[PDB]
Amino acid sequence: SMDNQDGFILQQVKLSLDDPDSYLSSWNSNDASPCRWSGVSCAFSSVTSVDLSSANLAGPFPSVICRLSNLAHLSLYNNSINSTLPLNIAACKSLQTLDLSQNLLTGELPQTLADIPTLVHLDLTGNNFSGDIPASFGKFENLEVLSLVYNLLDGTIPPFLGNISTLKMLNLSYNPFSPSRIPPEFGNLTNLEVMWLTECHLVGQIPDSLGQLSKLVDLDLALNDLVGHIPPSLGGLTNVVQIELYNNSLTGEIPPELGNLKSLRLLDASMNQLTGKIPDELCRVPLESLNLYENNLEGELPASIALSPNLYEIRIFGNRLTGGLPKDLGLNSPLRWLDVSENEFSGDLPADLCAKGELEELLIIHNSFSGVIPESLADCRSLTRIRLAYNRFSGSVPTGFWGLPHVNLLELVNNSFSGEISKSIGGASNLSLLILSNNEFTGSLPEEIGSLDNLNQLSASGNKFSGSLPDSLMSLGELGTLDLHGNQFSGELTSGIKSWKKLNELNLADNEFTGKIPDEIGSLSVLNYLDLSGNMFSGKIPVSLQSLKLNQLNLSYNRLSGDLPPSLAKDMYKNSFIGNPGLCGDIKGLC
Amino acid sequence: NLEGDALHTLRVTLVDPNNVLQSWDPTLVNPCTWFHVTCNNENSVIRVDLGNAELSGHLVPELGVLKNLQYLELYSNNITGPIPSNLGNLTNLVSLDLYLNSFSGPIPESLGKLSKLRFLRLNNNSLTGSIPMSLTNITTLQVLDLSNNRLSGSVPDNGSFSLFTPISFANNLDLCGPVTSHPCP
């Protein structure tokens, strides 16, 4: 006794599977011992473990491997294994862990898997398994981990999976299940730490029973059609760190009992129909991330949230949130992302948002925020996205704020901001989109704007900016939109406009620009929309304009003179040249 | 939102060597902040500006979801395959510029459903078959270029085509009509 043909059995496996990359080259038939072979693990020389992960192995599950008597750990993760899982898999009665993730296995789950008493870990993720989960699964003896994620199972959610006492993790996410309620019997899963039921077509109320799982760490019931009030019993999850209820039809008020969760860090109940005030007790908990966005919540954000030293994510946008943001917000926390957009938030912004220095996203658009940008934000080189638009903000922009290097979008649109753009704009390397429209800003555009070659969009509409366009502005080849309308800009366009090869839109309307249109306008390959209306542009229209294919052209109310070229005669250019006195052309009404 | 998801679908099926569609983050609430995408005051897409972007690959029917789109500019690229039918569901479209590409197959009949279309530039493509008579029923049509194509059959001379010149239907395989030198048989 105590001798085996384990190497032979492995050679049978090798012959059964296609190995184009010859990953199983180490497996030498002629060798006495197989325990030095690639991915083969012997705890005497009996095989206890085989791992053939990412081996480009193709073929059916090799049921002959079960004749390996002491095999405890089998992984065939990330392979091209195909066909139905053989019911003769039960023969592997010594297996504790089985990983068959990222394989092309298909058909109904083998009920015989439950017949393996020793199984502790089962992962069948990224497989085409279909049909109802076998009722035998309820009788798993020592299974702690069940993963059927990203499979094609079209069955209801099994109440019998509640009878597996030893289970720590129930992972059935991203399966096209028959619309089914969460079993209350799942509450009797005493040792469960993870309930991952995202995109499982879950319907109906969340059971009060789910509260009795005190070992629960992660509760993900997101991306489902679950309705009803969030259960107050949920505060019974002593060890809960993460609750995800996002993208559900749940109605009601966020329970105050959630404050009783000492270990809670991440809560997401976003994209729900929840109503009422955000609880003070929840905000008292030192939350890592609080997302309650796209809800019908009302009232003031409790100031207790500022005390948390673990806060990097606050996304509460799309609510009717009144009052002002807490003064100490961002001072005691590593703030990275803030989204208070589409709320009724009012008052000066908390000054110490970037105190920790990891703040990348500041989004406060469509609120009633008033006052001046805090000077601290000038020190915030961490910022990449800033959206302060549609608030009541006034005063000059801090010099440093213009020059933050990794900002790619700066949006101050629809505020009452005043002052002149600093020469510090040259330091904004990552800036691609600059939107300063509908503000009270004044001055001449800095020459340092030409430094920003990577800049793609400039919109400064409804501003009091004045003077000649910097010659540097013509150096911005990558610019696709230039909107300078409703400004006091003066001067003549140069031949350098030729460098605007990638420009899609030029709007210089309602300005004091003077002089002849440069004949290089035609050289702009992708110019489709041109508005030079309400200016003092004079002289003959360039013949190069005809070469351009323009969807929008307005040269109306200028000093342009000479005959309209033959192409321009069309009624499609009817309202394009009104108000230029020296323009005499074929259209009905002109001259 | 739905409009951003439809545009991201296009990103997946297009080849973008220069990463011109990098701004197209599907996790953004709406696609308006994206470069090459323009929106109205109600945050609905009105323009897609992707001319001369070295894009290849194929279009998707999900472009049809963009009901308030006015300008579809995919010109001077190497995009291949057919123009989808769902492009007719673009009720507010004013410009369809697909010229200087390698599009193939028929000009969809659905393009006649574009009641407010003003510019149709499909020139310098490998489009094949007859010019739909539905196009004539577009009252707003002011510009049409179907030149440097391999289309065939009757060239409509009625409705919006009444004003159109030979340069619009030039260098085609076998177009017969009054505008053409050879008559229709």
């Binding site: 990222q102 993720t125 990224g126 994620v149 990203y150 996410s173 991203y174 993870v194 991952w196 995202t198 992660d218 993900d220 997101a222 993460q242 995800e244 996002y246 993208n247 991440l266 997401d268 976003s270 994209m271 991330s289 997302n291 966005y293 796209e294 994510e313 996304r315 946008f317 992302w337 989204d339 957009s341 589409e342 996203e361 989004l363 658009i365 996205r385 959206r387 | 996790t27 953004l28 609430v29």
Partner: peptide, 12 residues
């Protein structure tokens, strides 16, 4: 592609 159990990332 296989996702993870964590907070949603929808942002303006």
């Amino acid at each position: 592609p296989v996702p993870t159990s964590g907070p949603s990332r929808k942002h303006n």
